[PDB]
Amino acid sequence: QTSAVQQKLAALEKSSGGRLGVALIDTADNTQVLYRGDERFPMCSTSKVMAAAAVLKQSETQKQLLNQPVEIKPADLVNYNPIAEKHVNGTMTLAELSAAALQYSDNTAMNKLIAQLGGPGGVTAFARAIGDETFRLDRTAPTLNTAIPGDPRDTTTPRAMAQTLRQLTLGHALGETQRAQLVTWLKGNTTGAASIRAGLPTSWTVGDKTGSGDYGTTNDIAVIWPQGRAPLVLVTYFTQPQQNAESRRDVLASAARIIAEGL
Ligand SMILES: OC[C@H]1O[C@@](CO)(O[C@H]2O[C@H](CO)[C@@H](O)[C@H](O)[C@H]2O)[C@@H](O)[C@@H]1O
Ligand SMILES: [K+]
């Protein structure tokens, strides 16, 4: 069936010129709204959530892991390193790297998390351990953001990512302390006000992670606490046909607005 909300999302998509993917889980009733929910999309930096979460999971059996220092060398700096570049020839702890990756989208910090997990496949292995059979991370940053149409590397589906984000932030994929830390980090994101958040009523609370890459890829994944409603999880992925396309955070905001109006 096609719902009214799906109809509106299809109209948004057609006016956007790109390809939109949406998955909502409403934890009031566990119902779901999906638009291209089983198509693959390039995650770009939304994959940082899974990497940070995997390190949180490791910290459940090492109480001191988040205070472990990691050396930052000049050679480690990549294309976007607003926090790590201050620490070159110095160190950052795994907590500092997780915070920098999630809240500032620091790519050097992401690469340190990936290295702590043994490479991109270690992030995929964590996804599998928590029941996500779809997610794959294949490369480090920044090349995980190439976002080439049809390329399966560094992709997931909206359905899979919404389920996983729910298990991580509202469910029991992580220990209680670790879940709370992940939620605190997401809620402190600096990069999200133009994306899902822009489509929701101001009274609602959001924790989110954005992503962007080539092909005008513009993504956001969020856990939302509506005014007076049980929490939602919302994934919005958007990608375009031309490599040099501009970002379209407004399309994500419009998707979120449609979802909110449909509740
Ligand atoms: O966007 C983060 C970071 O990436 C760079 C290239 O390393 O720019 C890319 O992203 C920009 C924003 O989407 C695009 O405008 C640009 O064309 C693309 O190369 C850095 O300039 C930027 O800080
Ligand atoms: K871009």
Q: Which sequence spans correspond to the domains of the chain?
A: 1-263
Buried b (16+ CB within 10 A) or exposed e, 48-86: bbbbbbbbbbbbeeeeebbebebebeeebebebbebbee
> Which atom of ligand 1 is closest in space to residue 244's alpha carbon?
17
177 Cα: distance to centroid of ligand 1 (angstroms): 35
Is 254 marked active-site?
Answer: no
Domain at 1-263, CATH class: alpha beta
Query: How was this structure obtained?
Result: X-ray
> Measuring CA to CA, which residue among 259, 54, 38, 46 is closest to residue 174?
54
Q: Which of 45, 47, 212, 254 is labelled catalytic?
A: 45
Q: Which residues neighbour 1 within 8 Å (Cβ) at sequence distance 6 or greater?
A: none
| Structural tokens at position 163 | 């389920």
Q: Whose CA is nearest to atom 5 of ligand 1?
A: 79
Retrieve residue 72's tokens. 């930052």
**What DSSP element (H or E) covers 34?**
strand 31-35
**CA distances in angstroms from 166 to 162, 179, 226, listed in the order given:** 6, 11, 15
Q: Sign of torsion, CA 1 217 155 101?
A: negative
Helix (H) or strand (E) run with residue 107 in it = helix 107-116
Resolution (in Å) of the shown entry? 1.3
Backbone φ and ψ for 16, nearest 5 degrees, come out as -90, -25
**What's the CA-to-centroid distance between 80 and ligand 1, angstroms?**
8
Nearest residue CA, atom 11 of ligand 1?
A: 213
Helix, strand, or coil (residue 235): strand
Collapsing DSSP to helix, strand or coil, 141 comes out as: coil
Which segments within 128-240 are labelled E, that is strand? 155-156, 205-213, 217-225, 232-239
Do the beta carbons of residue 254 and residue 21 sit within 8 Å? no
In contact, 164 and 132? CB cutoff 8 Å:
yes
Amino acid at 17: G
Q: List the beta bridge partners of residue 35.
A: 22
